[PDB]
């Protein structure tokens, strides 16, 4: 009976990621990492605005690597740990549902070499013991997501769910994450903990290999920017959404229903979105199809927002953070009013 997790999630309208922020990797071992990818320092106002528009859930991606002391303790620099807490507290201040993750650890130590399972597990666990100790007293609105797209960057199957050995490794790491949090007690005893597949991929072979913890307070996270060629810019990509590629969304979702939802396993899409390609009307329709699909079974999603819209780079930006104005109200409206 995993119903407690379902109840908790049902409280979310739709979520929002604080992209390219605490996840950013410049600035070395300092709080300036937050601004190293060109975003402004996150404020209470920014989070209020997100929550006010109707994203009552927020994902705070964070990359810890440069802020860790040497192994085996991997002590999180106190300055970084406290700023992370300040950002989570912005959301706590507004009664929001929250996901804290580890993020681009994949650039550093989180390289999915099955031969190196213990070292990987131990580091994940050492980080999450400290994070869990820091957020012990936070209520059940705050959730943890153990890893972000854990994979072997540069590998042939980096973005297609990796290899079998790799996926066994992901099970080991998911277990280590859960074990290390639960062992800290307090509100972490029953905190929703969000595990993931290899790369957060949702292809049948990836899901088929996913071990499901018997811990009843978990959810499974996936990323689906589906279809890739609509949402991303690339050779073969398109900007028109007429419905003809909805089967791509549908088909993938049937796998998630088969392996997760229909077995009573909570699922969350902790990232999705569509890069802006001067095509408001199409995104709006894609949203109807994409999110409407998720809505059939009460599945929630969090939208990736890197605050990039006019500039160059992947144009997932929605909230203009400096102006506290949305870059595109029509796209936003479709997301917040999806129900
Ligand atoms: O299904 C479309 C598939 O068709 C091929 O013919 C095509 O060439 C191929 O590119 C495409 O698969 C995508 O490949 C991209 C790189 O070529 C991947 O880009 C990455 O997407 C990431 C998101 O990752 C997760 O969600 C989507 C899911 O597809 C993936 O497996 C997950 O791990 C981004 O974070 C990253 O920036 C980007 O490079 C893309 O993910 C593949 O779908
Ligand atoms: Mg308790």
229 Cα nearest atom in ligand 1: 2
Give, as one character, the DSSP assignment of residue 298: T
- Is the shortest distance between the CB of 223 and ligand 1 below 6 Å? yes
Residue 163 near residue 197, CB atoms below 8 Å = no
Pocket-testing residue among 112, 159, 227, 274, ligand 1, by greatest number of atoms within 8 A of Cβ? 159
Tell me, in angstroms, the distance from the centre of ligand 1 to residue 231's CA.
10
What is the gyration radius of the CA atoms in the chain, in angstroms?
19
Q: Euclidean distance between the first and final Cα of the chain, in Å?
A: 26
Q: What angle do CA 198, 82, 179 make, to 5 degrees?
A: 40
List residues bridging with 100 in a β-sheet.
60, 144
Residue 47 near residue 116, CB atoms below 8 Å = no
- Is the shortest distance between the CB of 104 and ligand 1 below 6 Å? no
The residue contributing the CA closest to ligand 1 atom 18 is 159
Euclidean distance between CA atoms 86 and 90, whole angstroms: 6
* Structure's resolution in angstroms: 2.2
Kindly give the pairing relationship between strand 319-320 and strand 325-326.
Answer: antiparallel
Euclidean distance between CA atoms 310 and 256, whole angstroms: 35
Give, as one character, the DSSP assignment of residue 40: P
Give me the helix-helix angle, 164-182 and 117-135, nearest 10°.
30
Q: What tokens does 192 get?
A: 């929703």
Euclidean distance between CA atoms 110 and 11, whole angstroms: 32
Collapse the DSSP code of 175 into the 3-class scheme (helix H, G, I; strand E, B; otherwise coil) and give the result. Answer: helix
Taken in order of first residue, the domains within the chain and their CATH numbers are 1-339 (3.20.20.80)
The residue contributing the CA closest to ligand 1 atom 34 is 159
Tell me, rounded to whole angstroms, the distance of Cα 273 from its chain centroid: 12
The residue contributing the CA closest to ligand 1 atom 28 is 201
The residue contributing the CA closest to ligand 1 atom 2 is 228
Euclidean distance between CA atoms 18 and 42, whole angstroms: 9
> What residues are annotated to the active site?
149, 271
Closest by alpha carbon to 100, among 221, 203, 264, 257? 221
Euclidean distance between CA atoms 147 and 170, whole angstroms: 10
Euclidean distance between CA atoms 140 and 138, whole angstroms: 7
Euclidean distance between CA atoms 15 and 304, whole angstroms: 9
Q: How many other β-carbons are positioned within 10 Å of the β-carbon of residue 229?
A: 16
Question: For residue 72, is the peptide bond before it cis, meaning its omega torsion is within 30 degrees of 0?
Answer: yes
Tell me, in angstroms, the distance from the centre of ligand 1 to residue 201's CA.
9
Tell me, in angstroms, the distance from the centre of ligand 1 to residue 307's CA.
21
Q: What tokens does 208 get?
A: 């088929």
Residue 146 near residue 174, CB atoms below 8 Å = yes
Give me the helix-helix angle, 78-93 and 117-135, nearest 10°.
50
* Backbone CA torsion sign across 76, 102, 184, 14: positive
């Amino acid at each position: 009976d995993r119903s407690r997790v379902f109840d908790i999630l049902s409280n979310i309208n739709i979520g929002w990621n604080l992209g390219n922020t605490l996840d950013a990797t410049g600035g070395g071992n300092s709080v300036n990492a937050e601004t190293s990818w060109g975003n402004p320092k996150t404020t209470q106002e920014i989070v209020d605005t997100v929550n006010d528009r109707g994203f009552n859930a927020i994902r705070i991606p964070v990359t810890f690597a440069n802020h860790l002391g040497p192994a085996p303790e991997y002590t999180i620099s106190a300055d970084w740990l406290a700023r992370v807490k300040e950002v989570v507290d912005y959301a706590v201040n507004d009664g929001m549902y929250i996901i804290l993750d580890t993020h681009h650890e994949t650039n550093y130590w989180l390289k999915t070499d099955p031969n190196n399972e213990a070292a990987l597990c131990e580091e994940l666990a050492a980080i999450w013991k400290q994070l869990a100790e820091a957020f012990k007293d936070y209520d059940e609105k705050l959730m943890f997501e153990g890893m972000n797209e854990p994979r072997m960057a540069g590998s042939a199957k980096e973005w297609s769910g990796g290899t079998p050995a790799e996926r066994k490794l992901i099970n080991a790491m998911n277990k280590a994450f859960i074990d290390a949090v639960r062992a800290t007690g307090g509100n972490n005893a029953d905190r929703v903990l969000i595990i993931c597949t290899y790369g957060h991929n949702s292809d049948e072979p990836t899901l088929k290999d996913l071990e499901i913890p018997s811990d009843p307070n978990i959810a499974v996270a996936l990323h689906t920017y589906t279809p890739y060629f609509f949402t991303y810019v690339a050779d073969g990509s398109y900007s028109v959404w007429n419905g003809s590629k909805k089967n791509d969304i549908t088909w993938q979702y049937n796998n998630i229903k088969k392996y997760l939802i229909d077995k009573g396993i909570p699922v969350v899409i902790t990232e999705t979105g569509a890069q802006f390609k001067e095509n408001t009307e199409d995104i709006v329709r894609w949203i109807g199809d994409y999110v409407g699909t998720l809505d059939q079974d009460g599945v929630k999603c969090f939208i990736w927002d890197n605050n990039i819209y006019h500039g160059n780079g992947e144009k997932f930006g929605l909230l203009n953070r400096s102006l506290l104005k949305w870059y595109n109200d029509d796209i936003v409206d479709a997301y917040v009013n999806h129900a």
